[PDB]
Amino acid sequence: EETRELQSLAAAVVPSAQTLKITDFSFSDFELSDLETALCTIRMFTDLNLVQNFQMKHEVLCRWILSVKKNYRKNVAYHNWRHAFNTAQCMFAALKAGKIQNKLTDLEILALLIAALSHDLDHRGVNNSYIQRSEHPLAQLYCHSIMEHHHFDQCLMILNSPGNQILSGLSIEEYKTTLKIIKQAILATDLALYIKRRGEFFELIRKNQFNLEDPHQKELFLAMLMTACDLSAITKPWPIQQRLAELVATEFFDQGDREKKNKIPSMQVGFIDAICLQLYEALTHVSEDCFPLLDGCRKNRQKWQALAEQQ
């Protein structure tokens, strides 16, 4: 029953951020039920003052969260609701604990939270070609970042569904700006785009020319931040990361129409060196308080490498 789930969520009391541990970069969701993750998501919107600043009605926000959750496929090992929820939690932590909140506007924070939660909507698994083959054949080269555009379309449809319009409170101009930031935020989760633009971000930091005051770099930062949250499972405490790596490995090797372990340690070390280390280092420079993400990433590299050499 769906309306029953909505009834329960809407009537439930929302515990504090401290009680939910959502401010911790080390946050984990394994012990939480779907209902509990939904309550954590409400707390994120609430504490970031989005519910107040944009006059969201409780029942609407609840319905929206449940529609979002419902549109991820639980049969997919990694790209599912829990990943999206975790990505948003990391965004929340980076904003609060990481003190990034003060460097952005309310509309940017609103867009980021929604994007984090919506960035992988309807994902069918890295080894699934359905979404791509269901579009205009040579559709891969025309509308590039095909998956991300799909995720955004899904995000937008939910945002416009009756009873789910959490942005109805914004003015038309506020709305167009938010939608634009949300779209860019989601497109940014395409690693191909991350690898294409990260160089500029890194370059701007070396020369100490990074300036969030100019729109170009702010947009570049939001894109880098989204990626940082999207890959944050790589920064978790060793016992947690070991588990999240299992999920990634399952989707990569076992799923796609559904020894393995040995491939995992080297895969995670390669992933960290090639994609993660520089990003979290860069982020730490922008905000000293985001260090734990980097620290966590390093500790995990050490652990996986030790296994790679065989413990």
Ligand SMILES: CC(C)Cn1c(=O)n(C)c(=O)c2nc[nH]c21
């Ligand atoms: C999921 C995949 C597309 C990218 N990706 C990721 O996000 N995390 C967290 C990993 O640990 C990982 N290992 C390989 N690829 C990975």
Ligand SMILES: [Mg+2]
């Ligand atoms: Mg994605």
Ligand SMILES: [Zn+2]
């Ligand atoms: Zn993702």
